Amino acid sequence: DVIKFKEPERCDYLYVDENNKVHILLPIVGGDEIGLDNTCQTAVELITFFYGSAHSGVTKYSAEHQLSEYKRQLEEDIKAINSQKKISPHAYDDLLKEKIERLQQIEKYIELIQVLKKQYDEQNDIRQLRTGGIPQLPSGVKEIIKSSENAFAVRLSPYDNDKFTRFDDPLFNVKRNISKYDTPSRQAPIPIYEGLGYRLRSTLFPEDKTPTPINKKSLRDKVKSTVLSHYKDEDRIDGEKKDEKLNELITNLQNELVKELVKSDPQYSKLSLSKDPRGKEINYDYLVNSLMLVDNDSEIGDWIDTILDATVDSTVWAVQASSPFYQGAKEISSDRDADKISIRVQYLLAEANIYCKTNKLSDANFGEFFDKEPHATEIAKRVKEGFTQGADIEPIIYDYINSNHAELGLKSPLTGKQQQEITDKFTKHYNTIKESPHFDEFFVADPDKKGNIFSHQGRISCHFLDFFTRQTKGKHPLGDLASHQEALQEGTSNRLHHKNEVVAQGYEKLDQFKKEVVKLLAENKPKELLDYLVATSPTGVPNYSMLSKETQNYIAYNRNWPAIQKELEKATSIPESQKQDLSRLLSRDNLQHDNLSAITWSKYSSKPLLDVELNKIAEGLELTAKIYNEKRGREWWFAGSRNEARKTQCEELQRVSKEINTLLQSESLTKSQVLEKVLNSIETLDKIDRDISAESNWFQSTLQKEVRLFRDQLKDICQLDKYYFKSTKLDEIISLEMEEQFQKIQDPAVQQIVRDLPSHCHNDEAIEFFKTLNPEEAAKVASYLSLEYREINKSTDKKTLLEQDIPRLFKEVNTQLLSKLKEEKAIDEQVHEKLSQLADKIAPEHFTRNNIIKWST
């Protein structure tokens, strides 16, 4: 007796634009703007899109299945709307239209995915994703990346490089060592002694083992150097005029602090060093005799230290943005450190190169220039210089670019604004990849520029149609989807919203409709209501097409109904077929009167599904283990030899993946089951990380950085509010914390009542009130609430006071009938006064003409 609308406001891979065009987006890599380099990255996204899982899963999470499910939900919603058409022909016409348009497009995309996989995969370009040991980007995808305007790969030169690069057309490329994977031992690479990478590494820490000092002093270290530049080693705050030298130093320090602050952030202009954060006045007595910190003849700097510590807040220090280059360390005192910075520098050059490419200033490969001499060595030197002096590293690089701006394919060098744009991107993106296992390559996207690459749901993606067109080589025409790619290009941005507002508005429009209906009834405006109900949409559909059990009752049982009924008869501007519709739907005295179904939609469809997200994690663990074992050679045979610790850890990853997988297989999944598996999985991953940490000895293990990533992902899942859950039992997307709150209602009859109630009755305060009731008290309240919109909070809501409020309203509503009957003379005064006493005790739904006739007899 309730219609539950099942089309979700969100679906993996599915974007719906403002003109209701369905766009499916094939993902290339996971991330926004930049995607991290991990053994499996590009793999996981594609594998999932095309097949639910590489193996050990159902086809449940593929694009085809997910779209087929979406398709089914629409068909259910359409069938439901149609069920209401028998009662009110216009019912939900706008929604029905929108839902049919999406249905038809969804169906077409599904055929294409079916077709592409069967007819146009003869070389096994898709298939290899799930079978081949190290999956490759498909051909279509590589073509899309090559031809892109807003997305590019950059290849870097870390010391321990990995030859299995996925991106074959980097914009930025530098010379790399011979990967350990091209050596027989497979344990360390063969270094090369030319190139930018070697020049940076060897310069920042040479084979003489002579460290490079990192002397960065700011901002307090800087201010203390500038203020002490004017003072001597000897002078104290002593002599006859001790308060005056103090006050001068406080003013001088104050001035220099606000001066270096505004340069960094002009917004801390009115700060005082003459009073502490409490509000008490800073003076000689206060620092020497009340706190005891600074004695008499204390040094100038210790006075400065203490003034600062007493007056300044802890937040302000370190307030200014920090370069990725300055991580805090004293000096570059090992090889590990040198590579961290080699890569940092390389990545900055990569980022500048990217800026210059997306902005059409150059088409060149900056790395092809900086690997050549003298440039390789000269930039490595200037950087080492810079670190010792503590200077800003970023401009050193920009200056050298400007110094050779023509050689790098630019007409003008980089402006000060352009330079800051680059620096800030470099900062954002480096911090994202700071803890990447690998630094071989990175795919970077710009969604604020036009091109063939997009950003949707935390995936960097291409249009599925672009990939399809290309994979089939133009053979299968798109039919009605042939204009769709264009349509998306024609958009405002390439950064697409994670949820689909067009769908969400479909429902919000219904909510808005009841809200108005509720308002106009409370303001007792029957003529405006009737006008609002016949008012049309741009498609000409009258507003009464959004009537449902809730609103139909609100009107039918209202005091303004007789006024509304009169307005209805006495009106000419409204066609008779709607004039009947309305009287049929809202006059309970009409013999053709029939009740519409109640209407609901999920309040949590816009959130990512728990199971979908877990699947991605399981899938990622499997892949990692698989491509890891496929990257070792020629040592496949048992056994270690220390083989087990590396190998039993990989067995441990699969164990987790299998377990998460079997967790998902279960229907009737509960908050506590999920939480329990997820922590037990987190702990296993934690032990693995711990086992590695001890072993050393000491080398940074890529696997450690990989398990950390997976643990974090699983930690994110424990915030179950951020996800929704498909209940297979009730076929609806719910929240596990709403089911918690519903379950916390003891008695099953009361609980069900509360569930069947409108959304306004599903808040926390309300369910507490309702659990102080019994099944008979509950149904009385339910009926009560169906008569006129009221909110139940704790305050002000009294169970007793409510049992006076119900009777009042029952009696008021039912009198409408009795007064009508005695005016008609359809009842004796015998039964009029007998019923008039009964009026406050009988639910209006049961207080009807037939019932009275039956009742008297």
Numbering used by the authors: 8 to 864
How does the study describe this entry?
The effector SidC and its paralog SdcA anchor on the Legionella-containing vacuole (LCV) and are important for the recruitment of ER proteins to the LCV. Recent data demonstrated that SidC and SdcA are ubiquitin E3 ligases and that their activity is required for the enrichment of ER proteins and ubiquitin conjugates on the LCV. Among the currently identified PI(4)P-binding Legionella effectors, the protein SidC and its paralog SdcA were shown to anchor on the LCV through a 20 kDa PI(4)P-binding domain called P4C (PI(4)P binding of SidC) to facilitate the recruitment of ER proteins to the LCV. Recent structural studies of SidC revealed a novel N-terminal SNL domain that represents a unique family of ubiquitin E3 ligases.
Crystals were also obtained with a truncated form of SidC (aa 1–871, from here on referred to as SidC871) in which 46 residues were deleted from the C-terminus. The final refined model contains two molecules of SidC in the asymmetric unit and each molecule contains all residues from 8 to 864. The crystal structure of SidC871 reveals that SidC comprises four distinct domains: the N-terminal SNL domain, the INS domain (which is inserted within the SNL domain), the P4C domain, and a C-terminal unknown domain named CTD. These four domains are packed in a single arch-like shape with the P4C and the CTD domains in close contact with the SNL domain. Unlike any other known PI(4)P-binding domain, the P4C domain of SidC comprise a four α-helix bundle and the PI(4)P binding site resides in a highly positively charged pocket formed at one end of the bundle. A pocket is created at the other end by two loops (L1 and L2) connecting α1, α2 and α3, α4, respectively.The calculated electrostatic surface potentials revealed that this pocket is highly positively charged and it is the only area clustered with positive charges in the domain. The interaction between the P4C and SNL domains is mainly mediated by extensive hydrophobic interactions between residues L629 and I633 of the P4C domain and a hydrophobic patch consisting of residues V50, I53, A60, I140, and P141 near the ligase catalytic site on the SNL domain. However, C46 in SidC871 is shifted away from H444 by about 6 Å.
